[PDB]
Design a binder for these strands. Structure first.
Length: 111
DNA sequence: GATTCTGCATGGATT
DNA sequence: CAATCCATGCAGAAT
């Protein structure tokens, strides 16, 4: 917890983000600019640690095809929301470690 | 059949 | 006017 952080993206949780589908949508602009570059629909597996804790979480960061561009999504978020009790309007903020791109990325509104 | 997963399409609101 | 973003609907696989 001697961490130095840079914000990569932030999302206001909507109904489907905390819904039964178990996936979280991320803003396309910031996801493309700051999140690792995705060159396949298969996506990648990313893990992000809580800023306030030593709890680490593993998600699948992938994209869907939409129109001629993309929609970015973070799959397998069911237990994350359930465990953290995230409701509509809560904030999921994703950060970055400065020397290493280790994805600290926690909710709990924060800011 | 009925139900859930998964990836894409639709459609309102905004850039 | 047309393009973009994204919440959600929804068709086809999988269970």
């Amino acid at each position: 917890d001697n961490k130095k952080l840079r914000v990569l993206c932030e999302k206001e949780l909507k109904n489907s983000d905390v819904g039964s589908l178990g996936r979280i949508v991320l803003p396309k602009r910031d996801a493309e600019a700051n999140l690792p570059k995705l060159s396949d629909k298969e996506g990648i597996v990313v893990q992000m640690r809580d800023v306030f804790s030593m709890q680490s979480w593993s998600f699948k960061y992938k994209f869907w095809s939409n129109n001629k561009s993309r929609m970015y999504v973070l799959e397998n978020t069911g237990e994350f929301v359930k465990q953290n009790g995230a409701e509509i309007g809560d904030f999921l903020t994703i950060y970055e470690d400065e020397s290493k791109n280790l994805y600290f990325a926690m909710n709990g509104n924060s800011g």
